Structure 1
Amino acid sequence: PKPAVELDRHIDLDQAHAVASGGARIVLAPPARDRCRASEARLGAVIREARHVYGLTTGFGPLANRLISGENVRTLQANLVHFLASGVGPVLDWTTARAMVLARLVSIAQGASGASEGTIARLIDLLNSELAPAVPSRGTVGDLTPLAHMVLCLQGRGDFLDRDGTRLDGAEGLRRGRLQPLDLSHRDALALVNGTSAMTGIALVNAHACRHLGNWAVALTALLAECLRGRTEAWAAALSDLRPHPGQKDAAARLRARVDGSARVVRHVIAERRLDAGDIGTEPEAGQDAYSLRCAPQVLGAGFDTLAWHDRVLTIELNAVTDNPVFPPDGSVPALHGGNFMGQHVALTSDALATAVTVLAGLAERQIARLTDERLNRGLPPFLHRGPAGLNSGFMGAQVTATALLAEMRATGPASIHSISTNAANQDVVSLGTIAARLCREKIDRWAEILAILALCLAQAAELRCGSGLDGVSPAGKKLVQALREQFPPLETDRPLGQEIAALATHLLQQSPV
């Protein structure tokens, strides 16, 4: 009884990802079907009336001053798909390519693109099938190129990808997924090759992954506190109220919940202690933890607020019409020409999220560095090894790997600042939003690997500190370690961890600890 998302006007990010990931099927609501039929009729009229419209009676880009006779429009649009198919590089992953198709569909569903029923049906069919078009990730300045490749795929002139990433030729794809070859006879090619569908698709996948990684970041910080006698007073709600950033209040509340029931953290407020002359001297530990624990609400919180902004902007973009030209539903004018395809919004939010992800990955990396340092981990074995010290190095290698992954993340900055005048100066400013979204994705993948290493370290640390029975560990903490131990054995002796790290990271990106 696979869930179904009925698309009318608005779709939220979770619904969008459910469809893109194949978790839910999609259906076009009757009201939307009618709006599209109405827009299809407007396109037909615009064409019959020989209105001066980009892509219907003109060339493309700077060549738009070259008018085209009606008799040659099917050729014009066929060549459009052709000359735009210059993409190169690895193909977008299965879920992301599907998210791109969904983004184009949501835009069309608003009823201002003139797409024909058949065209809309082909997109819905793809989304309801187990396939995804195989489209190169590079080539656009922000998303005609990847969309042109999508068109070729839907016509059976390009490869398809199954859930595993294995490619099928065009014919096989249409066959296996029961897809009908795309037919652009209605001259509605610009309804498919238009907008910010690719960057939006990539960004929606980034948004979903960050939600899960954010949950792990919280869960692991909480478990870290249980392994290092962390002080919970730094996570007090009263502190959040004094500096009311939503993301911070949320992070602190979630951290408190994770360690609820723990007998391993320090819950005493230090100021409750009254000192006398005999207390004046040097104590073993300071009354507050290092920042990787004490400032977690503030660091994680800032990241959560960046994601919140990113998602607010993305929700608007996903449900908008980023086409050019557009055909006003009210019929005020035959069509409007502008630049709603300029993806500066997703470009700027992706760059911002990328920075936030790098910052949070840095936190996890430092948490690993502290947990594995015998001089800072308050009594735990160096690098959390088991067996004789020296002969065994435990997580010593994995710890450096986390640092290496972080260092690589830092080498890449915002994509948005690199606009270069192109297309014979017609596109004198470009968003590079697709690139921005892809760079953010890479950082998200690195962050998952760093968190994976931290998770494996914590599972081991929890047992070293509290015994295999995890005595004193919170219910949430126990469940997380027990779940990890179902697939990842304790490190009783040194062994290669690379494959386990990669395996766990893939899981972190798709599911939260609950």
Structure 2
Amino acid sequence: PKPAVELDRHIDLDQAHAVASGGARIVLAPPARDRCRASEARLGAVIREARHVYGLTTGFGPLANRLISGENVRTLQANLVHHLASGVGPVLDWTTARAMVLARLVSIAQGASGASEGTIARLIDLLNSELAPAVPSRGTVGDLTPLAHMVLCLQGRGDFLDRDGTRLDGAEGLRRGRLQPLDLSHRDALALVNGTSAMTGIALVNAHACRHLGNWAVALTALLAECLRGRTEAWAAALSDLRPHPGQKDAAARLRARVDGSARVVRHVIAERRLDAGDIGTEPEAGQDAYSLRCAPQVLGAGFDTLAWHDRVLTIELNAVTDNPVFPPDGSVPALHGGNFMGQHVALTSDALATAVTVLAGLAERQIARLTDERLNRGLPPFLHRGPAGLNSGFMGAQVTATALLAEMRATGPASIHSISTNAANQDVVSLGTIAARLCREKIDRWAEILAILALCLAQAAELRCGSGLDGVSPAGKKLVQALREQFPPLETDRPLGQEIAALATHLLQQSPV
């Protein structure tokens, strides 16, 4: 009975992704419909009164100094969509493109965009369908270009994408999705080509993916402890209280929960032990684990606090009106002209999250490096191989692949610092927020692949250490390994792992270990 998200004023990130991913239908609440009808009328009055407004009585960009007569507005807005459709590059994926449509709709729902009922209906119809507009990913400096392409698609003059990414031409899309062609006769084109919808859509998908990968990062760190006799005192709540960062407190708590019931971890607090004369000397192992285990709360915690900041800012952006111009619902003035379309907030938060993702991917990569090293994995086979050593190398190749993926992630930095004056110097500063969000997404995809490798390594390591029965392994750990084994067989002998790594990565981005 497909769930339904009723949009009034505010929608959270989970609800937004539910709609964007097609897991939920979207309906406009009565008060939203009324606010929008009132705004539609205000746009009508602005046109009727011949108010000096950008896009209604003026050209675009530096050409806004050219005033336009009412009889040429249809042509004015038609060419607006035309000159902006200069995008190139691979199309945004199905979910992301739909997230963009949703972002524009949420802004419009605030009742300050002047969008007609039909226009709103076209956006709602798309979201309730199984399709997404096919829009090029590159072209914007932060999001008129991708939105212009969206408009063309909705008019049947651009391709559509099905859940699998297969492309349909304009006519087929409108047909298969039972959609009506977009009509901009009300001169409300600026309600569709405006704001930060693309970067916001991309970022909300990033937020969802990071939540799941963060759960896997925690789950795998915990399982790693069960495979290497990790010490749980480093994850004690007392330490969190002494350094009260919310993300760290949460990370530690989640780690403790994962290993609850485990007989494979070391829970003894070393300071409890009293030493005598015969103890002085060299012990087989130090009283503390390497940082990839001991400092997991602190590293994961910092990443989680970054994601929390990213989500706070993104939630405001998603539910805001980033349009220009805007028509004040209070009727104070006919319209306001400013720069709420400047996507600097998503640009900076996306860049910050990208750095955090790279840091956490580094943690996972080092956890793989330690687990597969016979000199560091406390008795486990080199590279967790099965069968005769040498004749079999196990995950030796996959371990290097994880390193290669991480190295590539590091080569790309923040997008925000590259602003270049453009548009005849009119846009002398630009956010590049769309690019920032896209670069962050690529890093998230690499992180998923690294975590997938770590997951496959841990499933094997758990069985090598505790037997196929996973004796002593926590209930959470057992459930995770058993769940993986349902689709990924043990590595009893070397075999190509590339397709399995890719398949598992796709899963990690959409579901958590529960």
What is the TM-score normalised by the length of structure 2? 1.00
Distance 1:489 1:330 in 2: 63
Distance 2:285 2:386 in 1: 26
DSSP-derived class of the 1:142 partner: coil
Distance 1:59 1:179 in 2: 31
Distance 2:200 2:179 in 1: 24
Deviations 1:98-131 (A, max 9, x none): 0000000000000000000000000000000000
Q: State yes or no: 1:452 paired with 2:449.
A: no
Percent of aligned pairs with the same residue?
100
DSSP-derived class of the 1:89 partner: strand
Deviations 1:126-154 (A, max 9, x none): 00000000000000000000000000000
Partner of 2:54: 54
DSSP-derived class of the 1:383 partner: helix
Distance 1:479 1:321 in 2: 44
Distance 2:112 2:331 in 1: 10
1:502 is displaced (CA, Å) by 0.1
DSSP-derived class of the 1:427 partner: coil
1:364 is displaced (CA, Å) by 0.1
Question: Structure 1 stretches of 5 or more lacking a match?
Answer: none
Distance 2:68 2:375 in 1: 75
DSSP-derived class of the 1:97 partner: helix
Deviations 1:345-402 (A, max 9, x none): 0000000000000000000000000000000000000000000000000000000000
Deviations 1:171-206 (A, max 9, x none): 000000010000000000000000000000000000
1:259 is displaced (CA, Å) by 0.2
1:340 is displaced (CA, Å) by 0.1
Distance 1:228 1:75 in 2: 69
Distance 1:33 1:495 in 2: 58
Distance 2:179 2:279 in 1: 78
After superposing on structure 2, the runs of 4+ consecutive aligned residues of structure 1 that deviate more than 3 Å are none
Partner of 1:216: 216
Partner of 2:408: 408
DSSP-derived class of the 1:198 partner: helix
DSSP-derived class of the 1:436 partner: helix
Deviations 1:404-432 (A, max 9, x none): 00000000000000000000000000000
Q: State yes or no: 1:35 paired with 2:25.
A: no
Distance 1:99 1:468 in 2: 43
Deviations 1:215-246 (A, max 9, x none): 00000000000000000000000000000000
Partner of 1:371: 371
1:494 is displaced (CA, Å) by 0.2
Deviations 1:55-88 (A, max 9, x none): 0000000000000000000000000000000000
Distance 1:60 1:294 in 2: 57
Q: Cα RMSD over matched residues?
A: 0.2
1:499 is displaced (CA, Å) by 0.1
1:156 is displaced (CA, Å) by 0.3
Deviations 1:457-486 (A, max 9, x none): 000000000000000000000000000000
1:504 is displaced (CA, Å) by 0.1
Distance 1:91 1:245 in 2: 39
Question: Structure 2 stretches of 5 or more lacking a match?
Answer: none
1:328 is displaced (CA, Å) by 0.1
DSSP-derived class of the 2:414 partner: coil
1:312 is displaced (CA, Å) by 0.1
1:487 is displaced (CA, Å) by 0.2
Distance 1:121 1:391 in 2: 63
DSSP-derived class of the 1:137 partner: strand
Deviations 1:260-280 (A, max 9, x none): 000000000000000011111
1:326 is displaced (CA, Å) by 0.1
Distance 1:247 1:178 in 2: 45
Distance 1:6 1:178 in 2: 22
Distance 2:65 2:331 in 1: 25
1:25 is displaced (CA, Å) by 0.1
1:321 is displaced (CA, Å) by 0.1
Distance 1:329 1:388 in 2: 75
Distance 1:371 1:287 in 2: 19
Q: State yes or no: 1:330 paired with 2:309.
A: no
Distance 2:283 2:23 in 1: 56
Q: State yes or no: 1:512 paired with 2:512.
A: yes
1:441 is displaced (CA, Å) by 0.0
Partner of 2:358: 358
Distance 1:222 1:79 in 2: 57
Distance 1:390 1:511 in 2: 36
How many residue pairs are counted as aligned between the two chains?
A: 514
DSSP-derived class of the 1:374 partner: coil
Distance 1:20 1:485 in 2: 31
Distance 1:326 1:468 in 2: 64
Distance 2:51 2:9 in 1: 28
DSSP-derived class of the 2:250 partner: helix
DSSP-derived class of the 1:121 partner: helix
1:212 is displaced (CA, Å) by 0.1
DSSP-derived class of the 1:388 partner: coil
DSSP-derived class of the 1:90 partner: strand
1:17 is displaced (CA, Å) by 0.3
Distance 1:74 1:507 in 2: 47
Distance 1:72 1:180 in 2: 25
Distance 2:32 2:426 in 1: 35
Distance 1:130 1:401 in 2: 36
DSSP-derived class of the 1:26 partner: strand
1:254 is displaced (CA, Å) by 0.2
Partner of 1:8: 8
1:327 is displaced (CA, Å) by 0.2
Partner of 1:226: 226
Deviations 1:436-463 (A, max 9, x none): 0000000000000000000000000000
DSSP-derived class of the 1:145 partner: helix
1:506 is displaced (CA, Å) by 0.1
1:42 is displaced (CA, Å) by 0.3
1:252 is displaced (CA, Å) by 0.2
Distance 1:162 1:512 in 2: 25
1:54 is displaced (CA, Å) by 0.1
